[PDB]
Amino acid sequence: PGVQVETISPGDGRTFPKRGQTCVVHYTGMLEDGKKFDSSRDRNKPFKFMLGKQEVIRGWEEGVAQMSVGQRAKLTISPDYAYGATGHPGIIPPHATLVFDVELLKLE
């Protein structure tokens, strides 16, 4: 599948992201073996995005939509729902499944 969502700690079970809302998160991005390539946590600054604008990889678009506010989850994202056969220069190899540890902090 494009994304698999595995819950680390539950959310509110009620408030799920909608178009027009700003999702505020912390994340750590890694390969399937846990090797870290990026983290907002390390910058002590949350990351913000919105649905429906093609501004995040599709695995986030579909994974975070399945999370409720407060939830922490592991999103395992297939290459086609991330950087595909190309990868990301300097950061992620070709054909890489990505794992993001994401905390959905709030909707604004």
Ligand SMILES: CO[C@H]1C[C@@H](C)C/C(C)=C/[C@@H](CC(C)=O)C(=O)C[C@H](O)[C@@H](C)[C@@H](/C(C)=C/[C@@H]2CC[C@@H](O)[C@H](OC)C2)OC(=O)[C@@H]2CCCCN2C(=O)C(=O)[C@]2(O)O[C@H]1[C@@H](OC)C[C@H]2C
């Ligand atoms: C430290 O910078 C990070 C981005 C951010 C914090 C800084 C901004 C606002 C940069 C601007 C620079 C700019 C010129 O606008 C930017 O790139 C914004 C953009 O929306 C990103 C937020 C988005 C992304 C790269 C979308 C692509 C847009 C093009 C489409 O074709 C692509 O489809 C395949 C998808 O990121 C994502 O979807 C995913 C999921 C959310 C968390 C980040 N993501 C990751 O994969 C990471 O962990 C990664 O390390 O995060 C860093 C990132 O640098 C560029 C490389 C990637 C590997």
Ligand SMILES: [Cl-]
């Ligand atoms: Cl935003």
Ligand SMILES: [Cl-]
């Ligand atoms: Cl925006």
Ligand code: NA
């Ligand atoms: Na943008």
